[PDB]
Amino acid sequence: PGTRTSKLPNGLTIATEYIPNTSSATVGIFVDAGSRAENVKNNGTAHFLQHLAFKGTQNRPQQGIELEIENIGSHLNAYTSRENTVYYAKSLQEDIPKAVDILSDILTKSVLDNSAIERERDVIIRESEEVDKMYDEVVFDHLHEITYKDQPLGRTILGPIKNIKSITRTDLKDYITKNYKGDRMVLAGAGAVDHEKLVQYAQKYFGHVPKSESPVPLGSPRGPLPVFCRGERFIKENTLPTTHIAIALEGVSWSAPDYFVALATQAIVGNWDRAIGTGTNSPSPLAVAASQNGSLANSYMSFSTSYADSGLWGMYIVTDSNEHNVRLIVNEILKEWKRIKSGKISDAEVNRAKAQLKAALLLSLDGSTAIVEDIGRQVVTTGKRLSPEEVFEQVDKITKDDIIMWANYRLQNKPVSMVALGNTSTVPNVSYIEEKLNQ
């Protein structure tokens, strides 16, 4: 009944949530690493490492892991975000320990063969080249670069081609040594899982993990708070049929008291697609404007990214490079934020947003995997897990006024960074946006 928690002598946290009537589960190891724990020449390591952990360990050869997992019908996966590195598995309950075993094995005792470390550099480039075809991904990488100017958060996860061709097996081993400390990781499980037994296996297969010499509780401040830098980066590209713009303002962080209120304001502005509509029975004035007299854009989407110590909140626009005056659409978006700031929003649309928000945060925690994803991320970046029940309370209590204050604090006399890719010729700059927004 709830999320059970236990700590190991080396700091490792074991966070569990039992699910009645289940015979399978998901277990994952979450580390407070990621690319924000790299430096300029380092950039790209954590991800590289991740690819390599699947190439073989001091106990199991690459193809030995594969065949072992497939014979019991489990699944192994991993990703790297700016804030963390995650390795996790899905398997029947009988195999829970066997999975915790392999997870620790791959995460720490990995071979990192130099031969592998070389064939990989090409796979990582191919990977990189695909991301460059996903404009939204591109536009957002740049936004992070100029918004977190010369800071950890500002660098991308994949890293520069440069570093991908120059990462040395020593870089890897160092990132491991430097970052992989017990007090910096959470082992999360949900499904058919006995909390106590999982705490045991945790000791047995993760006990051997180095403790930090200067341990800090999972939630406490990294060091110097990232700082939001107003800026703009226009990327002319006359060949693109569509132009992609992103406009952001310093947002909110995971543990912030106004976290949900920010997500609530995001929901109130919402999204829109020139073809599909808003996916709401009643479109906002912005949504209506966007579509009138020919369309002012192809689509727009509100976004709100969070980190433990910072946040980005804004709009992502997509225009036809040959048909739209980007300035026209930006005005309506600014006009909509001003509307929120001025209080002219109804009880009805606030409720719709709270409802949209509630469903998005809770009804979506269905599988053991989706649930582990929540336990894991919440604890490894915050130091606790707000239960579904608690999250429901946090959203349900938000008020029209709460939103209006939040809007006035964050969208009035505050810096804005921006990025445009494509037919840059019609995009207004940052001082224009700030003038109209603050106007």
Binding site: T305, L357, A360
Partner: peptide, 8 residues
Amino acid sequence: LSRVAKRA
């Protein structure tokens, strides 16, 4: 609700 940029 906006996703968390991840790379696999």
